[PDB]
Each structure stands twice: as structure tokens, then as C-alpha cells.
Design an enzyme around this catalytic site. Sequence first.
Site, mmCIF file in Angstrom:
data_model
loop_
_atom_site.group_PDB
_atom_site.id
_atom_site.type_symbol
_atom_site.label_atom_id
_atom_site.label_comp_id
_atom_site.label_asym_id
_atom_site.label_seq_id
_atom_site.Cartn_x
_atom_site.Cartn_y
_atom_site.Cartn_z
ATOM 1 N N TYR A 135 0.823 -1.224 0.000
ATOM 2 C CA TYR A 135 0.000 0.000 0.000
ATOM 3 C C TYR A 135 0.866 1.288 0.000
ATOM 4 O O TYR A 135 0.420 2.343 -0.479
ATOM 5 C CB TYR A 135 -1.006 -0.047 1.159
ATOM 6 C CG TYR A 135 -2.253 -0.938 0.912
ATOM 7 C CD1 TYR A 135 -2.403 -1.719 -0.236
ATOM 8 C CD2 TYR A 135 -3.282 -0.977 1.824
ATOM 9 C CE1 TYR A 135 -3.530 -2.518 -0.448
ATOM 10 C CE2 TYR A 135 -4.407 -1.752 1.609
ATOM 11 C CZ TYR A 135 -4.521 -2.534 0.476
ATOM 12 O OH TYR A 135 -5.679 -3.299 0.288
ATOM 13 N N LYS A 190 0.988 -14.964 2.745
ATOM 14 C CA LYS A 190 0.951 -15.816 1.553
ATOM 15 C C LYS A 190 2.344 -16.403 1.268
ATOM 16 O O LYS A 190 2.906 -16.246 0.181
ATOM 17 C CB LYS A 190 0.366 -15.054 0.350
ATOM 18 C CG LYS A 190 0.071 -15.904 -0.876
ATOM 19 C CD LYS A 190 -0.959 -16.955 -0.617
ATOM 20 C CE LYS A 190 -1.394 -17.668 -1.885
ATOM 21 N NZ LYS A 190 -1.846 -19.030 -1.553
ATOM 22 N N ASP A 222 -5.603 -16.899 1.445
ATOM 23 C CA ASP A 222 -6.703 -17.561 0.787
ATOM 24 C C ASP A 222 -7.441 -18.529 1.703
ATOM 25 O O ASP A 222 -8.675 -18.549 1.726
ATOM 26 C CB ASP A 222 -6.304 -18.199 -0.568
ATOM 27 C CG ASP A 222 -5.041 -19.044 -0.520
ATOM 28 O OD1 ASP A 222 -4.119 -18.787 0.299
ATOM 29 O OD2 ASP A 222 -4.973 -19.957 -1.382
ATOM 30 N N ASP A 246 -6.748 -5.491 5.550
ATOM 31 C CA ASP A 246 -7.854 -4.702 4.955
ATOM 32 C C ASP A 246 -8.965 -5.664 4.475
ATOM 33 O O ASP A 246 -10.127 -5.573 4.899
ATOM 34 C CB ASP A 246 -7.263 -3.879 3.814
ATOM 35 C CG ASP A 246 -8.297 -3.133 3.031
ATOM 36 O OD1 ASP A 246 -9.404 -2.951 3.581
ATOM 37 O OD2 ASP A 246 -7.943 -2.705 1.896
ATOM 38 N N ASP A 250 -12.473 -6.582 6.806
ATOM 39 C CA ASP A 250 -13.751 -6.246 6.178
ATOM 40 C C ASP A 250 -14.627 -7.500 6.023
ATOM 41 O O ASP A 250 -15.833 -7.485 6.317
ATOM 42 C CB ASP A 250 -13.563 -5.554 4.829
ATOM 43 C CG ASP A 250 -13.207 -4.070 4.968
ATOM 44 O OD1 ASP A 250 -13.372 -3.483 6.072
ATOM 45 O OD2 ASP A 250 -12.755 -3.491 3.959
HETATM 46 MG MG LIG Z 1 -5.840 -20.482 -3.196
HETATM 47 MG MG LIG Z 2 -11.285 -1.810 3.632
#
Ligand SMILES: [Mg+2]
Ligand SMILES: [Mg+2]
Lengths: 355, 358
Positions: A135, A190, A222, A246, A250
Site C-alpha cells: 500500500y 501468503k 486464501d 484490509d 472487512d
Molecule cells: Mg488459493
Molecule cells: Mg477496507
Amino acid sequence: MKIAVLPGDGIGPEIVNEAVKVLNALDEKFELEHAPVGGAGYEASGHPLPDATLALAKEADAILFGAVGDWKYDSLERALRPEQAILGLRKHLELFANFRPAICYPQLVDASPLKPELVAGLDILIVRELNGDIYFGQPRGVRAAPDGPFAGEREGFDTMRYSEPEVRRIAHVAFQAAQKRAKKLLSVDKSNVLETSQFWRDVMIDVSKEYADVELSHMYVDNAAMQLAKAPKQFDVIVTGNMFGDILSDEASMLTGSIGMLPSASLDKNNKGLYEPSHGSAPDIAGKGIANPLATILSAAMLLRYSLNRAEQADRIERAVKTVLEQGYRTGDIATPGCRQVGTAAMGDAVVAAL
Amino acid sequence: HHHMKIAVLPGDGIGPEIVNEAVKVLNALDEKFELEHAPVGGAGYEASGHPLPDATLALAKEADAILFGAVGDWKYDSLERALRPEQAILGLRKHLELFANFRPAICYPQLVDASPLKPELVAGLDILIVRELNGDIYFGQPRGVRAAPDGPFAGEREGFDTMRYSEPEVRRIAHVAFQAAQKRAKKLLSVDKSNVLETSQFWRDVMIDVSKEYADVELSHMYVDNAAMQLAKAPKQFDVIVTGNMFGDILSDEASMLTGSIGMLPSASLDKNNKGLYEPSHGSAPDIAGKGIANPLATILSAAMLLRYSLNRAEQADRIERAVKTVLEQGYRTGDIATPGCRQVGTAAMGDAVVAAL
Ligand SMILES: [Mg+2]
Ligand SMILES: [Mg+2]
């Protein structure tokens, strides 16, 4: 104890006015001072984070922030858009530790998209790194592709990066939160694909040596997205990077069914924090007197507990919210059969009466 | 007298078991297809010393589409990395330029209790996530660990990866997704993080440029955080969703969990001409390999996708999909989806039930 009150745009003033009402009903004397931010900042002085507003936020012991953004302001150039205020305050004040509770209130279980047994009693905490990651990472932009099969073509790019001290400091925060709860911490990354993520995991494991009383587990982002949906009560504290946090915070907010209840805190190294509703702007109802103020009021409770050493005052606010829910008060977004449906101000009044 | 040619690549373990049932269903249809088999994965290694034999790749290139089972088994796990069965998946995608990963999220009403969602939100779900497969941060250069070259933590140990997408990469995935939306309800949602990421704003701008060639499709945009919320709240709101590799990985996995039976889900990897490789999303299951109990439905549904998206044969695809819905209504279940009072069957008898429902 100085609080910078930055209401913002649209529903922001409406909801923050109720948090201020609640703060003013307590015994304690606070110094509250207001300043424009977001679209209101642009309207006042041509920038979403006016220098004087930043200065007030820097001087304060804590910041109580509403919401920024409205249709009126979507046309401004990118750097002057309301949302740049949130990012500037986080960056300039070094608020690297974001705390996102996901709680499902017993009166409101049916609002959840999940079967009720999966969400009844849900209370988990997501810790999101807020000052680093893709970000903010340099370099970034649009360029001619320097290499690969599409060398020479127009190409957009960003750089994901995390340095050791950046992971260390948010790790410590998350382990300290786990110690005070169920002593379980899940780190999400990840690492099977991303080098940044394997680096994150390595540092997390290194920090874990200092917290023998906390069970550390790891999960890929994931799979975390899946597991939050399947059974969010399996977790207690989750820690992750800016981008993944983020998305997952959410997701978790939506799984509670009622984002209008959930506050957010963003803290520095000294536990000075910016406290805000997690839900963001609501341009469809802005100014109509109906937005739920409870997330913002609960953010003021967090402010008192985590930045101003007034945990008893935080307790009183949280008790008052429970009480108004038990009394049947609901804003439109949380309306239930047979409830006492109220606008923002009358909800605030109900909370004050229950202090 | 021209027949379409389908390369059948069964693979290892459950692969042949499930593909045999998809072939059976294809052969039960009225139109004849040229089905030509070739070994892949461990079977490719046994025949030719490589998980993707030259002749298998040649057949895949020659064919109009590829039906693929599953590769991998414990007995092949000791091979050197480059020869392991799973390398065939990568090889096929690379050599055939299969950059668009089609990941349906479907929920059958008979199986709705496996979903964590309240049933009205998910029963009868049929949405499509198109995930860009070849690029993004998952492959972008440079990447690794280093001393931070600049910034407030310059000199500190730092991990890094580069997110990047070039114009041709976004343009090609846009075309495929828009064309899928035309074969469905003509709504395409592009997902990005364009408020923060330069890559995402670029993505969005190329998507909009492409959208001018598909005036009959309604294009909208959504940030990845918001999409993660909306899939959980009301997944039925969507038709087709297109997004990058990383965001697609997360969102498709989320959606797969929300359907409740990840094991029923078909998958495909398509090129710029909509020629695809079609395979069940589940991959290998060495624990049950050869035992005649694996669920063939995801593979059969993949054969339906093959007919729809590669072979211009939507009516035959519909016929297969209706047959699957019927056998579930009739109470047939494999062990993975067994429900109280069901007719529990192995792979072959499930295939026979689908053939009977055509
Ligand atoms: Mg996957
Ligand atoms: Mg958000």
C-alpha cells in the site's frame, strides 16, 4: 487530556456528535477541539488534511475521527480526495497498529449471513499492520515494462515490502493482545508464493520465542478467507499485513451482520491512537439523521481504554450500549421485529440515559 | 463429417476414475466427438520419463479442447522436482498460453446444509470468477530478501515482491471475461484495489478501454475488500467477476467455501481464442485413489464447461448440467456428499446415474 475531534463528511458529523454527547455526559473533564478533515477540509482550506488539522491531531492525546468521503467530492483530483486524510493521519502520526474487533451482538445475530450457531457469541480481534506493505511500497506507478515477454508495453506496478522492524513491532502488539485474551495468535500471510510473506513468517516465528505462553499458528490468506466464512469462532487474535488485513477485517465485519456496531483503533508506539467507526462513509443516508452512531460511540470507549487510561469510563459506555440494545433501541440498519426504531440523535440520547 | 477433437488427459489415481465418467457422459450424447487419450503426470513419467510427454503436448495443441483429470500420487513424490506429476499442470498452462482461470461457484439445493451461509443466500448459486492466472505479484520481478535500499528502514533486512501487469495482460483477460459474460447474463464486475494500487488503477483503465467493444455487457467495478464482504453477504448478486491472480485466488477460495462443497466444483484454464483445459478444481486424492469412490461430478461439470465455453455447444452443456441436478434430486450421492437417506454410490454408478438423467 486533549482529544482532537475530526468529524469529516456526511454521516461523520452526525455520528461523532453522538460520541461527543456521550463523552460530555461522563464525570471527567476532557478538552475537546474540532477541526475539519476530508471534504470538509477541502471546503475550509483546500486540502483534505489542512496543516492546522494535522497540527491539532499531533498535539492531542487521542483523536476521535468520523468518516470521510461523499459524492460531492469524488470529482477532486486524487491527492485532494477526502480519503487521503485517513492515509495522511496514519502516516504522519506513525499509527502502525490497527485493531479491528469483529463482535456479533446477541440481539443482532439474525443480521449475519451465517447460520446463527456460527456467529452467536463471536468476539475476535484482527490486528492489521497499517504503515507499510504494498500500500506504500516504492517504487510504484506506470512505466514501459523494463523486461519480460511484454517488455516495452505500458505497465502498472507496485512494490510489496516489509522490513524486519516493521514486522517485529506489529508482532509484539499482536502477541500482547493474545496474552490478555485466549493466548492464541494466528499469523496470516501468503508465504507459499510471496517472498515478503515468507520474510513476515520468519520474523513472526522469531518473535514467538519471547511468548512461550501464546500458541502461534500460521495460515495462508486464501485459506483464512475460507476459514473466517466457515467458522469465525475458531480464532481469537489474528495478525496480518496491511493489504491482507484490509480484506480479512472487512470480511469479518460483514460476517457479524452489522458493520454499524464495529469500531477501529489505530495506535502508535506510545498507545496514542486515532479512534473511528470501521464502517466508513454512507453517502446514501448522509445528513438524514438516521446513521447508526454506536460504532463511533464504541470507538470513544476504545479511546478512553487504550489511550487515556480511563478503563472504568470505557466500561460505563460499553455497559450503556448493551443496555440500550436490551431496551430494544435500534437504528434503521439494525432494526429487528418490534424494536424501538430511532435516528442517530435519539440513539445517542438512549446511550446517555443508560450511563 | 467434421468432428470436434478433445484431448483426454486422465492423469493419476482418481484422475482416470473420474475422467472415465466424464467420457461416458460425453459418449452418451447424440453428437460424436473425437476423444483421443494421452498420458500425463505420473502416467506420463511411466510412459516417457516426463509428466508432460512431447506427444501429449502435441495432442493438446492439435485438439479443440482438453479434458484433464488429476495428477499426482504418493508413489511419484520422490521424483526430482521438475519431473513431479504436478509440473504437467504448469507446463500445459505455459505452453498453451492458458491465462484465464474460470472458477464457477455453484451450490446445489440438496447440498445446501454444507454451506456456512443461511440457505436462502446460497441455494442455486451460479456465479463465475475469472482469475488472471499467468501474471501479477505471484510472478512479478524482482523479488526476494535484501537490505532495504531506501525508505525509513533503509539498511534493515527486508522481504519484497513486485506487483505488475502490462497492457496486453489486462486486455486479454478482459476480452475473455467479457465474452463469458455474453454467454451468461451480460454483467461483468471487475475487482481491484485502484484507490491504493497503481497496478489496480491501470487494470481498471484497461478494463474500461476494452468495455467499449462490448456495449451489450454492463461493466461495474468493486474494491477487493468490498467484494470479500459482498460475496459473504449476498453472493447471488453477481454474474461474472474478473480480477487479478492474487485477488482472484482469495475471492475464488472464499466463494468455494461459501458453496459448502468445494469437491463438486469444476475449473478451466482458457487462451485468447477460448480454447480451454477443463478439470475438476479438487486435484489429486491419494487416500482414495483407485478405490472407485471419488466424486466424478466436478469432472463431468468440467466437460459441460468445455462444451459451452470452448466448443460453442451451450445446449449440450445445459443437458449435462440438468442431468447432474437431476441425480442429486433423485438422491444419488458419492461418499464425500452423502446425506441422510441418500442412495450412496461409487464413481461409476454415479456416472451411470448422470447418463440415465440426460
Ligand atoms: Mg488459493
Ligand atoms: Mg477496507
